[PDB]
Structures are given as structure tokens and as C-alpha cells.
Design a protein around this ligand. Sequence first.
Ligand SMILES: *[C@@H]1O[C@H](CO[C@@H]2O[C@@H](C)[C@@H](O)[C@@H](O)[C@@H]2O)[C@@H](O[C@@H]2O[C@H](CO)[C@@H](O)[C@H](O)[C@H]2NC(C)=O)[C@H](O[C@H]2O[C@@H](C)[C@@H](O)[C@@H](O)[C@@H]2O)[C@H]1NC(C)=O
Ligand SMILES: *[C@@H]1O[C@H](CO)[C@@H](O)[C@H](O)[C@H]1NC(C)=O
Ligand SMILES: *[C@@H]1O[C@H](CO)[C@@H](O)[C@H](O)[C@H]1NC(C)=O
Ligand SMILES: [Ca+2]
Length: 317
Amino acid sequence: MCEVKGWVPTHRDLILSRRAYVSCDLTSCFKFFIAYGLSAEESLYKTPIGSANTLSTSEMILPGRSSSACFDGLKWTVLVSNGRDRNSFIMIKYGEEITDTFSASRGGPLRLPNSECICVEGSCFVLVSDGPNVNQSVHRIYELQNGTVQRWKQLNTTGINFEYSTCYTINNLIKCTGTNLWNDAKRPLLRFTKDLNYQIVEPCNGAPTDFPRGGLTTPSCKMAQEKGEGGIQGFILDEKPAWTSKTKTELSQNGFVLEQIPDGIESEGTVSLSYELFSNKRTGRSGFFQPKGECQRVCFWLEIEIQELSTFCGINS
Ligand SMILES: *[C@@H]1O[C@H](CO[C@@H]2O[C@@H](C)[C@@H](O)[C@@H](O)[C@@H]2O)[C@@H](O[C@@H]2O[C@H](CO)[C@@H](O)[C@H](O)[C@H]2NC(C)=O)[C@H](O[C@H]2O[C@@H](C)[C@@H](O)[C@@H](O)[C@@H]2O)[C@H]1NC(C)=O
Ligand SMILES: *[C@@H]1O[C@H](CO)[C@@H](O)[C@H](O)[C@H]1NC(C)=O
Ligand SMILES: *[C@@H]1O[C@H](CO)[C@@H](O)[C@H](O)[C@H]1NC(C)=O
Ligand SMILES: [Ca+2]
């Protein structure tokens, strides 16, 4: 059908930025990011993908410290979190209007994933996390329409933590990669549908892809507990073939390696093809985005160190 058989690069008064990601409308793609100062408060800004982030090129959206954004074919849905603890909240804008809010249920802070949310046939889906401790975190999928919350589903994530969710959609399934900041150096995976049925699975190989992490181990569908605490946003293309991604080694954030696994992420993890990128550059967060115009496209963004996003897109059938 539409196997991803490789990846190619597609993009290579300054505002200081963190938690950036990419999202696209029908013609163009944007960097959404949290601006926290000037190369001489915290607010979601947006900039055309070809430009540097600067007061002249970047557009302020709303105050906040995490975010998500997605285009539904008609208008932008944007979410930001702000406030603290039990008074932490998320606000949502649809086009130019603020359309909804909700507050923390489990002690806060409310946290958005800092990757694009996923719109399918006018509904948009976003993962929201809550809870003050990574060892007792709560995660919900919120379904939106026109920037208004229609419903949500809290997930059973007992025994894991699922932060920094980065998601894509193929064939009206939505698939997200999580970062476990508590007790796993492998990345938890989420699969869900427009009806909010879902499955959470663990990679069954022996090569953890979080940073920090331990060394390689025997393949199994067990969690990789060694150096499981902490983590950084990243992605796994959860298809057949699957593709994993990680720093070159567990000792350094240099480099970025992509590995193709034809039998999928729940198999023993035999690699058929690998890439090595950015060999002597420090790399950071990574996540999915999907441009909008046969097979559905999938791309990824990656922080590189002065710290900028590069983007790569998948080549299909
Ligand atoms: C809530 O989920 C937990 C853990 O489920 C496992 O990890 C999840 C993140 C997800 O990936 C699931 O697909 C995984 O199974 C589950 O507890 C686990 O249940 C399995 C058996 O179904 C056990 O083998 C496993 O030891 C257990 N893990 C832990 C950490 O407790 C919960 O289901 C269950 O509660 C436990 C205490 C058992 O009594 C079990 O019979 C009961 O169904 C699940 N809670 C609910 C209400 O479904
Ligand atoms: C959860 O982690 C926190 C932070 O380190 C710790 O204070 C607490 O004891 C842990 N709680 C449980 C249930 O183990
Ligand atoms: C969303 O706006 C559309 C216009 O595209 C309208 O037809 C629809 O009823 C709205 N849906 C909700 C849930 O408000
Ligand atoms: Ca981890």
C-alpha cells in the first residue's frame, strides 16, 4: 500500500524559543513555539517555516507555556496552557476567537504536548496531561470541533507516564508516540480512533529510543527500566514497516539515527535499513507533522543546535 521507504530533508531582533513544532494549513507550514525572551511573558508565537523567529517575522498568539495547534481545513485550532496547580487551565482559540477553556482536574499543571494536534473530518484530537508527579500522571484525549470541547476520554496509563505525545494519522487511525519521564527508556505508543477507542502498547525490540537511556538489551515487550527516569520528546512511526529514531548513542545527544523495522514495532525489531544524520551536531526534541495537500504523507521535525528545527518527509509507494 503506502510503506514509508525512506526520508528526505525538506527544510534546513531574534526571539528565544523553546517547545517548537510544525503544523500546516492548506498551502504553507508554520513553526509554533513558546517565546520566553529576546536576544538582548512566555507566549505562543507562530512563524512561517522559511523564516527566523523574530519580532518582524513572528506572530504572537496567546500567553502560555505549552501548546498544540492544528488546521482543520477551514481554521486554526490553537490550545495553550497557563496558570499553576489546581488553577492551571487550557484555553482554545478557533480562528480569531477564544472558544473554550477548561481547568486542571488532578492537581495540575495541565500540559499540552508541544506538537500538532490531529484533525480528521472537522474534529480535532489532542492529548492533555495532568498531575504534579510523573509517577501518578493522568492523560486524556480531548475531541474538539470548531475549538469547542465535545468530549474527552481519560486513558488507563497505570504503571507508565505518557508526556509529549506526538501524533499523526493514517486511514482514520490516530497514532501517537509518548515520552515516559518516570520509568521507561522505551517510548510508549498510543493508537486510537475517532470514537476514542484506544490501545497503548510497548515496543517489543531491544533498542530503547528515549534520551537518557541504557544500552541495547534482549528484545522483549518489557519496559526498559534502566535510566528510564527523565526523557525527551520523540517519535516512532508505528506502521509496517515501522521506523524508530534516537540519538546515535546513549552517552551523548549527538547525531540522529533512523531505523526501519519491516515487521513493525511489536516484532523483535530486526532492522532492514538505517540512516545516520547530523553526526556531530547536538540534536533535541523531535515529532511528527503532516502537510495537507495518493498515500498520506508523514514528516518529522527535529531540534538541532542557534537552536533550529529541521524537517524531513517520508517517501511512500
Ligand atoms: C489499567 O491498566 C493497567 C496496566 O495495563 C498495562 O499497561 C497499560 C499502560 C496498558 O498498556 C495495558 O494494555 C497494559 O496491560 C492494568 O493492570 C495490568 O493488568 C494486566 C492484566 O490485564 C497485568 O498483567 C499487569 O500486571 C497489570 N499492571 C499493573 C501495573 O497493575 C489494569 O487492569 C487491572 O488492574 C490490575 C491491578 C489487575 O487486577 C487486572 O486484573 C485488572 O484488570 C487496568 N485497570 C483497569 C481498571 O482496567
Ligand atoms: C512519586 O514520585 C515523587 C517525586 O520523586 C515522590 O516524591 C513520591 O514518593 C512518589 N510516589 C510514589 C507513589 O511512589
Ligand atoms: C462547527 O462549525 C460548522 C461550520 O463548518 C457548523 O456547521 C457546525 O455545526 C459546528 N459544529 C459544532 C459542534 O459547533
Ligand atoms: Ca524516560
